[PDB]
Symmetry: C3
Subunit: 86 residues, 3 copies
């Protein structure tokens, strides 16, 4: 039953534990909702067009579904290192 | 990240924009076993598969998933309301 | 649509009937969060530490957190399901 394990392993590696961002509050949070402190507002429907103003050196964390995922997918496809806030 | 992108890409291909459905009004399916749609419970979706038109695009927790799987296995082009 | 069916088939195989669990009442439910009568409290942050107490013959039902627990159980060889 390597499928479940493989699926869960990859599903989980998409999230950043609240306890991990905990040690940083390196990380740049990104609220991608539809208009938490230290959160640079930036809806997913715009994240693409505004992907230039993002510093690849910092790891991105997005929180809200599908909104988070899409935004997460944009970042990871672009090559950035990103996670979704658990 | 190929594995993440591969999982996020396929996961998201399962949903359809909630704004896109209302726009069109696609044949929505209230698959809850407990507006302007069709009551198509999951536990009864398989048995009532006949009623389904193999030319329309259907839009449907674990029940939503199950129903979609049923629709897609059957060969229908379905999606879950995001 | 093969990828989709492949993903749902495996995603769905991770859950267990909510009716079956109470129905059996070979299932040992586990409250992993840090309620449901009969559920054995066991935080996910401790599951990996108490993976020896579990009976390899009993089927486990876990009540991201719920998933991490499942992953621990399955990886160790235990047969587990997430309570749907």
């Amino acid at each position: 039953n390597d499928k479940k394990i493989e699926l869960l392993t990859t599903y989980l590696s998409l999230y950043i534990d609240h306890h991990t961002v905990l040690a940083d509050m390196k990380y740049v949070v990104l609220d991608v909702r539809n208009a938490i402190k230290g959160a640079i507002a930036m809806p997913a429907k715009d994240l693409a067009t505004r992907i230039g103003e993002l510093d690849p050196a910092k790891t991105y964390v997005v929180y809200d579904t599908t909104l988070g995922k899409t935004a997460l997918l944009v970042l990871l496809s672009a090559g950035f290192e990103a996670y979704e806030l658990a």
